[PDB]
Amino acid sequence: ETIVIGLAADSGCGKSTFMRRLTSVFGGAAKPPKGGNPDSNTLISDTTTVICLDDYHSLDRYGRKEQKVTALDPRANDFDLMYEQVKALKNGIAVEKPIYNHVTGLLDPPELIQPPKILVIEGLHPMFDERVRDLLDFSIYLDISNEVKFAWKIQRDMAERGHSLESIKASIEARKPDFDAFIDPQKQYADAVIEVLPTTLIPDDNEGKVLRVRLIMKEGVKYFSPVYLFDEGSTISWIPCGRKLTCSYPGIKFNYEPDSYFDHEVSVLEMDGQFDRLDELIYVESHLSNLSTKFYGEVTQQMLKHADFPGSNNGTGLFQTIVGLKIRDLYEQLIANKATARA
Template sequence: MSGIPGTDHGHLPFVLGIVGDSGSGKSTVAQGVASLIGADRVSTLELDDYHRHTRAERTELGVTALHPSVHNFPLMQEHLRLLGRGRPVRNRRYDHSDGTFGPIRTVDPNEVVLVRGLLGFPNDELRAAYDLAVFLQPEPELLFRWKLRRDVKTRGYKEADVLKHIARHLLDSKEYVLPQAERADLVVRYEIPEWDAPDSEVRATLTLRRNAAEAVRSNGIMHRFGGFVAFEEGDDSLTVRVDSGLPPEMVDGWAEERFADTYQPGALGHFMDDDGNDSRLVPLAFAQVLIADLTQKLRRTAGATHAAAAA
């Protein structure tokens, strides 16, 4: 196939899914990945746009945003299929500020289509639409902490309302969101040694499967981080454990090496701390670089496969 608008050398767009519970860091991870790949090479699809109901309607119906019934999966699947073939799609936009829908907008596929949302691959049919599926899974205490912080400090919610919201979401999250981890190529789990440990002690465990695991095995990083990053082989997986003390210059050097044209010093790993200030979390930066690097490596593999098939 050739001549697809917005793609390089006629290759099909690469569909990257970043999925996780509310407050898991999807937007933060996605922004870092897009900045490394290059904003002009990435299109973003927000899965909240596929809600069937406004926030007020969901409240009236007594369902949460995590329940499958409030998502238009057939339309989502069709749009992912079209974007993967290099076709633009049109859909209304969900506005988080008031929980309503805005005007129709067009998403044009670029070299990478970055898909972000709560329920990106809830079944095998939707999972098949992604070239790389990433699931973010902070341990419960961190998820609670990050969601409360985000909703109060950036979305203007009252703390009491957020706490009620979290309580209503717990069962749906366990039943519908968390099982998606089993379908992911990469699961990023953030952990702390004790429930009251500060964010500075966050460490990450990344579990890679299938082609993603093989791509990391062959990308030359398994010996560059010393004792700060450990690699453990499984039967059909690779586990990467990132220590909270990983020096930021190690990750920065890796990012600059892999993305010399787009890397900006100190731009990765940023998150909002408990005081609402901008801080840096090195294991987060590591995850951003790894996902971007996997995307580029798997894109090249997919491009070669497409070219061979067309020959």
């Protein structure tokens, strides 16, 4: 059987990096399909196929322009086709999946997708429709706060450079009602949420480099033991920097606490600051628990393959890599059961 993983994110920045981090622990390099469309959003690897949910846009870019709607609006997406095709792939059936051409903003003729071992649906509405949601074996939500969203556009984007600060944040809040109505409530269905906030260690930092990252983990989910620090289920803050581990400004600060998140029980691990050298990453990993690693240091090693990645110096890469490991552990138990069941 194929196992299906939802990834809810805005397409701009972290989702690409998050997806690359998830692909690297699941298997080999994910590449576009061999022939066919050069503007295909599909990424294919030996174990995983990544489907961009833009392909299920029911509304052409110019159709949306003529319409009241935007890409966030459910009017603009075809959840019937999305449900049916995701459902078919999970049962080992190949699907003819249309292609949303981002360059031309057009719907291209479809591509035949073969059923993978690991299917990741990634985009704006993976958890929006309940039929789709019931198919997922694991759900991810990458939640960027608006403060950091703004910083990245200014500090880390070249397309936005033609626009003023006024115009860029005008657009952000102009899209905020649709986002709050249609994207943000998907958090409640996620098994793992990575919330990205400005750091508290530096007062008035808006640069997007030092960040407060929260890893919210649902409890009671079968095959998914949440990560914890020192004493599972208690409330802990933890500064690793000391006599034996020296840090630069501002350093590292960890928080671990239970919580109630959309009327579900969760465990929250939090890292504020950035790693200014590699010993701190090694030290942090050695003190976390329930990381779903195969050997001591795997989180570090898996991060070291993508040192150039954005967020590799802070909690973004650390928690995205941990979430990828937990997912692997989970599908192994799903698949273990499945393969033994077949026997």
